[PDB]
Each structure stands twice: as structure tokens, then as C-alpha cells.
């Protein structure tokens, strides 16, 4: 179970980003009950998650290239 786990990770990241986006969209239209500090914190958490994801992607692709560029 590798591709399934990777797709689950991507699903979680995209879901968090979508939640942040919809919360910001709900706030900017004037719906009560949404806090500016709350939406800012959620957006920052989403950005941190995306940065972690891209770091993992870079590490994995670098390892793949290093391990498959060698000559047997």
C-alpha cells in the first residue's frame, strides 16, 4: 500500500486547502460567526502543510533520480 497512502496524503492536503479557501470565502462575503484570526491561522496551517508536502516530494524525487541514474 504505497500509491493509496500517497493519494490519501494528497487528499488530506487538498481538503485542508479547500477548507481554508471556503472559510475565507464565507468570511469575505459578510457571513457572521467567522473570525479573522481563525481564518488567518487556518490559512497559515494550510501553507505549512503544503510546504511539508513539497519538501517530501523533492526529497522523494531526488532519491528516485539518484537510485535510478546509477549503472548496473
Amino acid at each position: 500500500s504505497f500509491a493509496g497512502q500517497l493519494h490519501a496524503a494528497l487528499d488530506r492536503i487538498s481538503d485542508r486547502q479547500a477548507a481554508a479557501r471556503v472559510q475565507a470565502e464565507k468570511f469575505t462575503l459578510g457571513e457572521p460567526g467567522i473570525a479573522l484570526n481563525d481564518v488567518m491561522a487556518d490559512m497559515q496551517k494550510a501553507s505549512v502543510s503544503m510546504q511539508m508536502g513539497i519538501q517530501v516530494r523533492n526529497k522523494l524525487v531526488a532519491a528516485y533520480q539518484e537510485v535510478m541514474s546509477m549503472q548496473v
Binding site: 494528497l10 481538503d15 486547502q17 479557501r21 508536502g53 516530494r57 524525487v61 533520480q65
Partner: protein
């Protein structure tokens, strides 16, 4: 269904841009072509006579011409709904891979996939149209590198016959320490160019891939 955000869509697309040109070309489309080209170059008796870059470019062009139909099918079925935002990336991947999977399965063997399934401990399939991408690729790769060897051997045979007959006639006429290879090489080259080995060979390879 849920749709991935653009920030991760671009990430996955760029990541796929690493594997897709390298592996999806090396072990999917023209491995047999490059193998048989190398074998033909060896059989010609003058290794590394044609430029490797020229051979690779010609092989790539022949590969594109070979896979043009399935390329067109996946192109329309993936891009056009994607271009009009009709489908999401997750379903677009499977929809595009379905015709490619069908074409790949059309060419593979049976014993290879059976052995791979038995190794992977997957449950028996009553319908052939259920092989996952995990099990499909190795069977196709091994079938390709199996058929390439026999095609190369068939190509090798006539030049071997010519070399044997010229060596035999030379030694019958009484030339022991005369290297036949340095003498037969012009004859092998003339036979190849006169029977149009390159054009006929690539046409036959294309027809074999089609059928």
C-alpha cells in the same frame, strides 16, 4: 466528486513530468525497437557505424508514428474534458490510462501475467479487463524483451549464413589466414543496402507492432 486544488494539481503534474518522459518511454513504447536496432548494428559487422544519436532520433520518430492512434485517443479523452473542465484530475488519470492499459495488454503474453499474479497473491480474475497497473507493466516489459531477442536472432541469421559461406569458400580455395570478416563486411553491407534492410526492417517492425 471532490476536486484537488490548483496548487497541488500543478505539483502532481510537474512531478509526473519527471517520470512520464523517462520511464513511460523507456519501458513502454520502443525498448524492443532500440534492442533490435542495437542487434542489427552488431550483426552488420561494423559496430557503432551509425551514430547513436541518429539511431535514437529515428527510433523516437518511429515510436511516435507507432503510438499515434492511442496517443490521439488518450489526448482527446483526457485533454478535451479537462480543457473544458468537464472532469477532475483524479478521474481523468484513469480515463486516460484505460486505452493505454488496453493497448499494453493487447501485446503481452499470458504465462508472464499468470506468474506475476501468483507471485503477488492476487485473487483470481474471471475477467481479463481487471489487471491493475501494479501487475500489468512487468508482464508487458518481459514480453517485449522476449520478442525482441527472437526478432534480432531472425535478423542475425542471414548475415551469419553469408559469413559462413564466404569463410568456407575461401578456405576451400586455400586461404587459411585471411580474415573473412574484413572481406565479408563489404558483401554484408551490399546485401543489406541492396535489399533495403533499413526501410523494409522498420516497416516490418511497424507492421508487427500493429498486429
Amino acid at each position: 466528486g471532490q476536486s484537488w486544488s490548483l496548487s497541488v494539481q500543478t505539483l502532481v503534474f510537474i512531478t509526473s513530468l519527471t517520470f512520464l518522459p523517462a520511464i513511460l518511454l523507456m519501458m513502454t513504447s520502443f525498448t524492443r525497437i532500440i534492442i533490435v536496432f542495437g542487434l542489427l548494428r552488431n550483426a552488420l559487422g561494423t559496430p557503432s557505424a551509425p551514430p547513436n544519436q541518429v539511431l535514437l532520433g529515428l527510433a523516437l520518430f518511429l515510436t511516435f508514428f507507432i503510438m499515434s492512434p492511442v496517443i490521439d485517443k488518450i489526448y482527446v479523452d483526457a485533454y478535451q474534458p479537462f480543457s473544458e473542465q468537464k472532469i477532475s484530475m483524479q478521474e481523468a488519470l484513469d480515463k486516460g490510462a484505460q486505452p493505454l492499459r488496453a493497448f499494453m495488454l493487447r501485446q503481452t503474453r499470458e504465462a508472464d501475467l499468470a506468474l506475476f499474479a501468483r507471485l503477488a497473491n492476487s485473487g483470481p480474475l474471471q475477467g481479463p479487463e481487471a489487471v491493475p497497473m501494479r501487475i500489468l507493466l512487468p508482464a508487458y516489459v518481459t514480453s517485449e524483451l522476449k520478442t525482441a531477442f527472437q526478432i534480432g536472432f531472425t535478423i542475425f541469421i542471414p548475415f551469419l549464413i553469408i559469413d559462413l559461406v564466404i569463410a568456407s569458400v575461401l578456405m576451400a580455395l586455400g586461404m587459411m589466414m585471411v580474415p573473412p570478416a574484413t572481406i565479408a563486411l563489404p558483401f554484408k553491407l551490399m546485401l543489406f543496402v541492396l535489399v533495403d534492410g533499413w526501410q523494409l526492417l522498420m516497416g516490418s517492425l511497424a507492421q508487427s507492432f500493429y498486429s
